Write a protein that binds this ligand. Structure first.
Ligand SMILES: CC[N+](CC)(CC)CC
Length: 286
């Protein structure tokens, strides 16, 4: 192993429902109040304090582990580009990664980016879920290429403004998500996630060297494959059923959520987020 990276006191997180700690809730309340067409209260009533899970997301755990403050800009539904899985948000706010980065840079008044802050990026799942649910026309390989380009452009734009430290999360294992299984879309997910995860870290290692960045790559797929091959070691019992079914309708939650991998048909439980955030903290000194 290599030397641990330097300690972290501030995180700025960008991403989707795997990171959101209340922005989708706040923003959809704002949109409902203004009567925006098609708005829905997200995430909904069978979720914990606005997170798309039954507890803190992995980046919240990561911040606790590292002794860092967290500014969490992630929005549930966020795509790698400007917009969201929810198309009805675009006429109000651009909540994709590109839009989160634009809003972060616009809310420093001109006051500098913190060169010591860790810029955490965790996105791409909604590029695939939007494409499958609404019959997108890109071949999956072109979709993956657009996801990688969008993430690299976000790191480039944050670096241009003065960011120096990053942690980018790979695609998750979309191929075991319950909604993907139920859609009979396992092979498509495998092909998508393998294309992103082969290309992205090669692109980010070139950008890290050019711009003199500290950029760590977290392989969520390796992480999940190890937990799901050895579930008992981690106190997991149920790897496929959601603890809290929502499709086609809401049904009562399981009694033992700490023994489940999935909270709903897309998102992991607090237990898996906890393990993920501990794993992400492994490259860093406290
Ligand atoms: C973005 C939110 N989801 C689709 C409806 C995940 C893709 C789940 C509720």
């Amino acid at each position: 192993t290599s030397p641990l990276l330097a300690p972290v006191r501030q995180i700025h997180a960008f991403g989707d429902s795997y990171s959101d700690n209340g922005e989708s809730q706040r923003l959809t309340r704002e949109m409902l109040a203004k009567g925006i067409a098609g708005a829905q209260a997200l995430p909904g009533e069978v979720y914990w304090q606005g997170r798309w899970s039954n507890g803190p997301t992995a980046v919240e755990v990561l911040a606790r582990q590292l002794g860092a403050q967290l500014a969490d800009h992630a929005v549930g539904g966020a795509k790698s580009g400007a917009d969201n899985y929810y198309g009805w948000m675009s006429a109000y706010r651009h909540t994709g990664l590109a839009g989160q980065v634009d809003a972060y840079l616009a809310t420093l008044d001109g006051k500098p980016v913190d060169g010591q802050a860790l810029h955490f990026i965790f996105v791409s799942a909604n590029d695939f879920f939007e494409h499958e649910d609404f019959a997108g026309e890109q071949p999956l390989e072109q979709l993956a290429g657009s996801s990688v380009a969008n993430i690299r452009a976000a790191v480039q734009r944050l670096g241009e403004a003065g960011a120096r430290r990053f942690l980018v999360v790979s695609s998750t294992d979309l191929s075991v998500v319950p909604a993907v299984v139920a859609g009979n879309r396992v092979e498509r997910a495998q092909r998508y996630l393998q294309a992103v995860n082969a290309s992205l870290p090669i692109q980010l290692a070139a950008l890290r060297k050019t711009r003199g960045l500290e950029l760590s790559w977290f392989d969520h797929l390796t992480f999940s494959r190890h937990l799901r091959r050895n579930p008992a070691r981690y106190g997991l019992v149920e790897l496929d059923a959601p603890c809290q079914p929502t499709q086609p309708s809401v049904r009562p939650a399981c009694a033992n959520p700490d023994q489940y991998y999935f909270w709903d048909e897309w998102h992991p439980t607090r237990r898996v987020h906890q393990l993920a955030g501990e794993a992400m903290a492994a490259r860093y000194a406290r």
